[PDB]
Amino acid sequence: SMSAGPWKMVVWDEDGFQGRRHEFTAECPSVLELGFETVRSLKVLSGAWVGFEHAGFQGQQYILERGEYPSWDAWGGAERLTSFRPAACANHRDSRLTIFEQENFLGKKGELSDDYPSLQAMGWEGNEVGSFHVHSGAWVCSQFPGYRGFQYVLECDHHSGDYKHFREWPTFQVQSIRRIQQ
Amino acid sequence: SMSAGPWKMVVWDEDGFQGRRHEFTAECPSVLELGFETVRSLKVLSGAWVGFEHAGFQGQQYILERGEYPSWDAWGGAERLTSFRPAACANHRDSRLTIFEQENFLGKKGELSDDYPSLQAMGWEGNEVGSFHVHSGAWVCSQFPGYRGFQYVLECDHHSGDYKHFREWPTFQVQSIRRIQQ
């Protein structure tokens, strides 16, 4: 129970925390706006952050929890990371998500308050999810079991947690889902 | 609370569950011994399994929980998977692991009975772990936060759960650890 400071991450433009450095305490819509050409390594010092492939928070999403990322494989196993924002709703102990088989909160539902490396192991029918309501916390969904493939992040403060369409988050393949750790 | 059958996985030698097929209900030390040339897709129907890069359960390890894996990116985001074994100790609700900063159960310790996408968020000092005692369950450790980078699996029935050396599991980098879901 050490006492942490405000959420913070640091980016560098060369691998292994070398080269040009910049620290963030709030979102950055494009590192190019700093004069950086690229982000090649990073550290998350406090909190949880979402990295995005393209400027303006567009493209592939990467969840960035506390720790050290010496090259791009550390966040995307994906070489390009251009914008960043805090996962503002992250609250690991206060996370609750409802998933639905179809869009618009229709079809069979599942209630999640824990992490699921295998939706199918838990009883979910099929490999698709159609809509989501985030009651609290921030969640990350993955295409494949064990938190692999394309990720996407769901926040409690997006349309009051409503994601009625895959347009709001078109492949509907989701096989693992977990809570984000701030 | 549907009733599941015995642990089972199925492999195919082409992507998308096409081509030659073979089902396992026990370990396979080499798919080449079946006459297969390669495994390109797979499904885990029941239980949790460990895939290995090389024959004889050697090389990179991949955790395979229930679901569908249409190509190699589904298990390794790593194209080669040659041998497979059940994660026999997997027991998600009955998993407990002790981690140590140094080898031989020395140094600071941490007690884990939950999943940790960020060891550093939980209070662990540094990015290294030196030894492990698995009290119960099966666990998977990852190099980077959020369950990325090289994985390795720790079982309760390996030397009574003792892993005193990195030789038993030399890079000591571990930033996330979770329980395997059978």
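The CA atoms of residues 156 and 177 of chain A lie 15 Å apart.
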